[PDB]
Scaffold this active site. Structure first.
Site, PDB file in Angstrom:
ATOM      1  CD  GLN A   1     -54.442  24.470 -83.426  1.00  0.00           C
ATOM      2  OE1 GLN A   1     -54.392  24.038 -84.588  1.00  0.00           O
ATOM      3  NE2 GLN A   1     -53.240  25.236 -83.361  1.00  0.00           N
TER       4      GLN A   1
ATOM      5  CG  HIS B   1     -43.355  25.094 -76.859  1.00  0.00           C
ATOM      6  ND1 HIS B   1     -43.684  23.724 -76.958  1.00  0.00           N
ATOM      7  CD2 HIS B   1     -42.708  25.113 -75.743  1.00  0.00           C
ATOM      8  CE1 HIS B   1     -43.263  23.321 -75.822  1.00  0.00           C
ATOM      9  NE2 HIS B   1     -42.387  23.963 -75.226  1.00  0.00           N
TER      10      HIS B   1
ATOM     11  CG  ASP C   1     -56.329  27.625 -73.283  1.00  0.00           C
ATOM     12  OD1 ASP C   1     -55.169  28.254 -73.714  1.00  0.00           O
ATOM     13  OD2 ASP C   1     -57.294  27.917 -73.494  1.00  0.00           O
TER      14      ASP C   1
END
Lengths: 431, 431
Positions: free
Chosen positions: B224, B41, B13
């Site tokens: 990630q 995305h 994030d």
């Protein structure tokens, strides 16, 4: 070149043993970063000849620190064996070896699984080495496996072990219809070495970063051959793990940009132990000759031994996959006496097209025919030679072509087993 | 750098989407090298908002070639859905996307299995994104899986699929007591797309090496956050994939010595979804403030993100694992209006021990208390500022402190969503 990586560039059996030992003289840390207890470093320790599969050969030098990174699947039984054996000869292992807390553990049920998956195939066996390596990596990504850091909390470990063993025992008794593995035995066996193992645990990735900032010489040691890489090799005649210098960062914790020099061990001719594509294999007298000269009757690691010419197409792929910086040429003396020597420069595909790069694994390797560049042999023996002038011009031209055909220089030439029978033209550590 | 790697440096994030998109304006090749259909995305295609989980955002540009590396586990179903949607909106996907022959296939049974495992543990997870990824990695490491390359030979594929489905269904029904997946369905489902897939297959490794020596710009996108890495993250609170830049060589075939610049996306404060160690977490007005200002709401398996101060001890681990070249700072404006800002510079262990490197995963992460460095906040708005002059001195001081504590420069400052709300102090492709 502070951080050096050393690995075989073909299908194993290139002769990484002598070279590794050699660089151990200037290296202060020696690090294993992939595979398991299959290193196969044969050596003569205190008179008698023995083999180290897990503990690096650097364990033999006084001020060298040997490290087993997280990339290595750790078998406590194998570790314990080699430790005892070395302690016997008076080697203080416990003070020269460090482990990563993230190494996955290979336990009894893992060997059982491997052995059951081998014999379950039967006629269609793969020629699995059945060491439990594959099953250990499998539990790791599945995230039901255990690592060295679990041994810090003994209760939780016992609990985690039960859940995994229940699942594997199930598969063993019902699917493979093999024997079950006793949970208590595995628990007692591990709990017995736990304290020993945890005492060698260190923050390996920070250690290697500190060594980097100080400019300490670090060597990374690869266990198997490039073309046997699980992703990029001759699939499916490949191995149970990654084998290229690309696994250095993930397997040790060192940042990708810090690898300085990658040394490819290159044998003068080709060999393959086992099934799989080998475009350059010989089935005639030269093949026989090489097999005999190479004294590779299955001399160290195998259920087969196929001979053949050097394959520059396949070596070019190794160059690319490992971003090789230089080669160390081994076993040139096996070609001593040939009237004519050959090197495969390209492949003729089953549909008539010619290629200079290895075809995809899915392509038809079963019908590739190598295109050879033929060149003059030499009669003078080049064994034990330690200077350029000691190499007949024909051999020098052979060396020369290899460098032209791959784009990588041959920085070292191992002309024999003794340390003195080596020609270091560049030295990975000073480059 | 000619070869740039962009990835999240914390727990996810971090906000890489906008940066990835900006970089694709220069990149000639865009490469995915890890994970599966979980990229998330979110973008705007041909006027409409869309979400791409598998196909790189670079598919939107005419000069760019998108490549999906071998390190990615590919679900043919997910792929077909994304391609069609794109084609619908007029983006000729088929001529701009390439695939490796070695990508492992995620099929209907991997999903069933992933689900069965969740069921077997607890029902409280709307499993929708990334299902099957883990089991696919398993079959690959166990050498019993299917790869894109296998779709070339139909006959063989069918027997191979039959053997592995035989194995998994035994688990499904006997062990998990769940329903079996039908063979014919999967075989047929997979046949409907087989040629669509193999027609996009290419020698990725050779291609990247060719681009490298030709000097074309190549960008690798990681999916990630660094600290969730399977080997190096906060075990056991990690993903099943490697998430650090070391995965680039292995997941794409590029030689390790060829990574030029590693850009780490750093959010100005931290967030973490789910459970696990978060030493700098906030349980106060400030915590709720950062959540509300940062719009840190549910989009991660039904939950609010936990919030806390930027942790430079945790960030220094990321620098080291990825060999970071520079940071792209995001969301500095979320700190606008606070009276003081804190940066954690060390950890105090339960045993009074004070460390500046992250402790092992096997250490008492619950007894860790963060040692902060507090500094003046700022009242001026920093949203959309496009030059360092529009930023208050207190902000420049924060920015400066981060580079001092970490050792890496902040090369890009993204101050807003529009591509113009960006300060490129260095440009990864020049450096």
């Amino acid at each position: 070149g502070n951080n050096v990586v050393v690995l075989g560039t073909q299908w194993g059996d290139e002769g990484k043993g002598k070279i590794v030992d050699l660089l151990t003289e200037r290296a202060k840390y020696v690090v294993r970063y992939q595979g398991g207890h299959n290193a196969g470093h044969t050596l003569v320790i205190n008179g008698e000849k023995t083999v180290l599969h897990l503990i690096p050969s650097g364990i033999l030098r006084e001020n060298v620190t040997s490290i087993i990174g997280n990339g290595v699947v750790l078998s406590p039984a194998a570790l314990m064996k080699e430790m005892k054996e070395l302690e016997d000869r008076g080697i203080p292992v416990r003070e020269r070896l460090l482990l990563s807390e993230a190494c996955p553990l290979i336990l009894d049920y893992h060997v059982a699984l491997d052995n059951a998956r081998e014999k379950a195939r039967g006629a269609k066996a793969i020629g699995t080495t059945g060491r439990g390596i594959g099953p250990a990596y499998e539990d790791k990504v599945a995230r039901r496996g255990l690592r060295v850091g679990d041994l810090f909390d003994k209760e939780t470990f016992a609990e985690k072990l039960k859940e995994v063993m229940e699942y594997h025992n199930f598969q063993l008794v019902n699917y493979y219809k093999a024997e079950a593995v006793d949970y208590q035995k595995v628990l007692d066996d591990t709990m017995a070495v736990a304290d020993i193992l945890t005492s060698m645990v260190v923050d390996v990735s920070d250690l290697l970063d500190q060594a980097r900032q100080r400019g300490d010489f670090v060597m990374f040691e690869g266990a198997q051959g490039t073309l046997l890489d699980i992703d990029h090799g001759t699939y499916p005649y490949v191995t149970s793990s990654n084998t290229t210098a690309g696994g250095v960062a993930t397997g040790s914790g060192l940042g990708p940009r810090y690898v300085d020099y990658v040394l490819g061990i290159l044998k003068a001719y080709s060999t393959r132990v086992g099934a799989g594509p080998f475009p350059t294999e010989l089935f005639d007298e030269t093949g026989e000759f090489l097999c005999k000269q190479g004294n590779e009757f299955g001399a160290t690691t195998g259920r087969r031994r196929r001979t053949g010419w050097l394959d520059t197409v396949a070596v070019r792929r190794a160059v690319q996959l490992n971003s090789l910086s230089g080669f160390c040429l081994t076993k040139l003396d096996v070609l001593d006496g040939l009237k004519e020597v050959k090197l495969c420069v390209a492949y003729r595909m089953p549909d008539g097209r010619e290629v200079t790069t290895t075809p995809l694994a899915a392509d038809d390797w079963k019908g590739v025919e190598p295109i050879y560049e033929t060149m003059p042999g030499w009669s003078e023996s080049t064994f034990g030679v330690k200077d350029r002038s000691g190499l007949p011009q024909a051999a020098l031209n052979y060396i020369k072509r290899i460098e032209e055909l791959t784009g990588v220089p041959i920085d070292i030439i191992s002309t024999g087993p003794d340390r003195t029978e080596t020609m270091i033209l560049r030295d990975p550590f000073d480059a």
